[PDB]
């Protein structure tokens, strides 16, 4: 009667790379046409959530995008995999941000360590914020009830969404875009 029937399972960590960080948001988009501006690329990835965009490097044919929710990112990966942008099938996956790239590209030439750092936590639990939701355009004294979306993100300022005023401002820019887009102003 020394040993026991059951133990909690112990398990090894997977070393923390960019591909296995559970807080990661930034989507790498490989194999672009390079005939495409950033503002046309932003029109593919706007609807999946709110974006805290980082860059498209010059002439490399492969940029990267960064959301604020992880849920929003995985809806974008499964959304647009093998989706042609300007007649070129697009292959996309997880990849790091711009500052961490430079910490990689200094190391890849000098193959020294390559020690990653994870994205910072949101510090749970935030009761207001619903994930994968957008404040579509910019006084509000709401009820703060659970059904409505109390807090939100602007395209970096934390705004209070008005449920009535959201749909009128989203449908405002919806009809505005069809008249500008038809005459080539916005793209």
């Amino acid at each position: 009667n020394h040993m026991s029937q059951f133990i909690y399972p112990v398990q090894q960590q997977p070393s923390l790379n960019h591909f296995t960080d559970p807080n990661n948001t930034t989507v790498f988009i490989g194999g672009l046409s390079s005939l495409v501006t950033e503002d046309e690329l932003r029109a593919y990835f706007q609807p999946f959530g709110t974006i805290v965009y980082v860059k498209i490097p010059v002439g490399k044919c492969c940029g990267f995008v960064q959301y604020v929710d992880r849920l929003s990112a995985e809806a974008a990966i499964a959304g647009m995999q093998g989706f042609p942008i300007a007649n070129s099938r697009v292959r996309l996956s997880w990849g790091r941000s711009a500052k961490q790239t430079a910490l990689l590209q200094q190391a890849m030439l000098s193959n020294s360590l390559q020690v990653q750092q994870q994205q910072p936590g949101l510090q749970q639990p935030n009761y207001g914020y619903i994930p994968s939701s957008t404040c579509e355009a910019p006084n509000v004294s709401s009820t703060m009830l659970p059904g409505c979306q109390i807090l939100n993100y602007s395209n970096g300022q934390q705004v209070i969404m008005q449920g009535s005023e959201a749909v009128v401002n989203s449908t405002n820019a919806m009809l505005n875009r069809l008249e500008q887009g038809s005459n080539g102003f916005m793209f």
Binding site: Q11, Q12, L16, P22, Q118
Partner: peptide, 9 residues
């Protein structure tokens, strides 16, 4: 048991 986790806890 599988030795490594899929994500980094």
């Amino acid at each position: 048991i599988p030795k490594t986790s899929i994500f980094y806890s």
